[PDB]
């Protein structure tokens, strides 16, 4: 019955889909979910062929909400070209700074996620599925465990689900403090009971994943779309937002805004609109100085008119929007990003291992005003050289945001070199 205490993150939707229930800050149990027509998409799905479901998800143009925006249908297609058995994994590791969109689905509308996992699993022929939830989401973990039992009792999980002949078990695994275990191959390693060490890709999981078998990894948000696609059909879904970047997307907005929280919006929304139209503008009506796209990118106040889509010029990513205003020290903020990568490199690759450490170590000296000229030159050098030989995206991006602050706010860095 009782769960650990959760802060009641604000949530708003113009689309009333992913946040239809999760916009209210409490657990929605199966009866309330069923009352809203929940699990009818599953029933429909089980009356369809796996191939047909893949087809609909493909034609929906659904993309991954885990940050890379990879077409979900195409991913599934790849998996089913490979002999079974196959595995389905729901990625609930959500640990990138500023990003708290997935947890509100987990904690408030677990059946939406579960229903999505069951459909997705059926589509790719997986009889065994996993949720990997970070260990710092203990309430989400217990909520999911209880929801799964509820689903079992109403006959949505187990053997021969609703007479369909399809069997499914969903196991819930917990992380234990490593951001890198959100990387799909390191997640799989952790599920296999090992340290979270990414594997060289290719192969991609859909070719070789859990126990070496075809495995689809999708983010919570991605999977939560699937019931809607089956329910509405792909045509109506494609009618949501702009025709190319169609469908709902979640935007966790934090920092110097009046209304921090998660916003369910179409992807033609601009960054400026997220901040000023939806999130209520800035604290104290101060000027926006920068937006940090999690720990990935830094947008200046001259880049607010971009769409929140997966276009070349679009915001992309997980739609994470951290707002800094005119008073916030960019170098101090960059330090916090450096600290994050320092604390999360898994250490496999030498430039990443030493690079993330030295970036933080040197940047701290710069910040405290204890950096020699050599420390300055060294900082510049190491920021440009975390990436070489790296086998996953962390190494590839650990210097990216900080580099952007150096390019976009030179005058503020210059003052530190004094």
């Amino acid at each position: 019955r009782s769960y650990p205490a959760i802060p009641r993150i604000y949530a708003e939707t113009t689309l009333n889909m992913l946040l239809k229930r999760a916009k209210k800050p409490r657990v929605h149990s199966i009866d309330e979910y069923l009352k809203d027509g929940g699990y009818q998409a599953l029933e429909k799905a089980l009356n369809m062929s796996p191939e047909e479901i893949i087809d609909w998800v493909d034609k929906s143009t659904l993309r991954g909400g885990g940050g890379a925006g990879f077409p979900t249908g195409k991913k599934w297609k790849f998996a089913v070209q490979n002999p079974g058995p196959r595995y389905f994994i729901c990625n609930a590791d959500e640990s990138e700074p500023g990003t708290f969109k997935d947890r509100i689905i987990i904690e408030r509308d677990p059946h939406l996620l579960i229903e999505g996992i069951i459909i997705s699993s059926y589509a790719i022929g997986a009889n065994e599925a996993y949720i990997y939830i970070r260990g710092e989401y203990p309430a989400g973990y217990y909520i999911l465990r209880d929801a799964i039992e509820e689903a079992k009792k109403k006959g949505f999980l187990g053997k021969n689900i609703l007479g369909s002949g399809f069997d499914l078990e969903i196991y819930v695994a917990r992380g234990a403090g490593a951001y890198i275990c959100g990387e799909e191959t390191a997640l799989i390693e952790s599920l296999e009971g090992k340290r979270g060490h990414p594997r060289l890709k290719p192969p991609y999981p859909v070719q070789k994943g859990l126990w070496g078998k075809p495995t689809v990894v999708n983010n919570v948000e991605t999977i939560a779309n699937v019931p809607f696609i089956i329910s509405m059909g792909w045509e109506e879904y494609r009618y949501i937002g702009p025709s190319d970047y169609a469908g709902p997307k979640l935007f966790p907005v934090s920092g110097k805004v009046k209304k921090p929280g998660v916003y369910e919006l179409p992807m033609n929304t601009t960054l400026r609109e997220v901040i000023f139209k939806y999130a209520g503008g800035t604290l104290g009506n101060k000027k926006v100085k920068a937006v940090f796209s999690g720990a990935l990118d830094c947008f200046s106040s001259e880049e607010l008119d971009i769409p929140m889509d997966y276009s070349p010029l679009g915001f992309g990513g997980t739609g994470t929007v951290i707002v800094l205003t005119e008073e916030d020290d960019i170098v101090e903020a960059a330090l916090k990003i450096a600290e994050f990568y320092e604390h999360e490199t898994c250490g496999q690759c030498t430039p990443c291992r030493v690079g993330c450490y030295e970036q933080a170590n040197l940047l701290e000296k710069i910040y405290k005003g204890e950096a020699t000229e050599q420390d300055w030159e060294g900082f510049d050098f190491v920021n440009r050289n975390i990436q070489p030989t790296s086998i996953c995206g962390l190494g590839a991006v650990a210097g990216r945001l900080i580099r952007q602050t150096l390019e976009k706010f030179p005058e503020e860095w210059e003052k530190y070199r004094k």
């Binding site: 640990s95 196991y171 600290e339």
Partner: protein
């Protein structure tokens, strides 16, 4: 000579039986142990390894890798304080200061009585509610010292 008490051994056995393969339950088992003792006893690792059918080596490596597990310090209540960008921007330092005022400890330290340990952590995925902290499994936004004091008084 170290052996788990039965009520814990039961729980560990439930985790080990939960996944298709025993070794998948390693992290659930270690959380359970840390919950029970208030840290990971070095001596706990050998019998755990036996139940997982894994080398001790493997288990030690896993404990070392995963930051949530603590082998050094027993504490009844872990106050995990977020030190990442958003919480820092919105007043992590006010929270830590308030914590020092109430408990008399800084991050990394345990109260003399072994009751409270302050653990600095990366983003807890609650950034809209910055600055964030947890007390064991419970998570909160910090509003003020008076507010923090009342929350902490709930843990005896």
């Amino acid at each position: 000579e170290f052996e788990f008490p039965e009520e814990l051994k039961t729980k560990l056995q439930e985790h080990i039986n939960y996944f298709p393969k025993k070794r998948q339950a390693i992290l659930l088992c270690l959380h359970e142990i840390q919950n029970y003792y208030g840290y990971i006893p070095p001596e706990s690792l050998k019998p755990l390894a036996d139940m997982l059918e894994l080398p001790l080596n493997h288990v030690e490596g896993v404990v070392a890798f995963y930051d949530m597990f603590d082998r050094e310090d027993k504490a009844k209540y872990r106050i995990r304080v977020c030190v990442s960008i958003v919480c820092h921007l919105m007043g992590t330092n006010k929270l830590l200061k308030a914590l020092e005022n109430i408990l008399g400890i800084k991050p990394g330290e345990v109260t003399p009585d072994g009751k409270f340990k302050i653990v600095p952590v990366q983003c807890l995925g609650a950034c809209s509610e910055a600055p964030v902290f947890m007390v064991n499994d419970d998570e909160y936004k910090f509003e003020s010292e008076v507010q923090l004091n009342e929350i902490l008084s709930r843990y005896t």
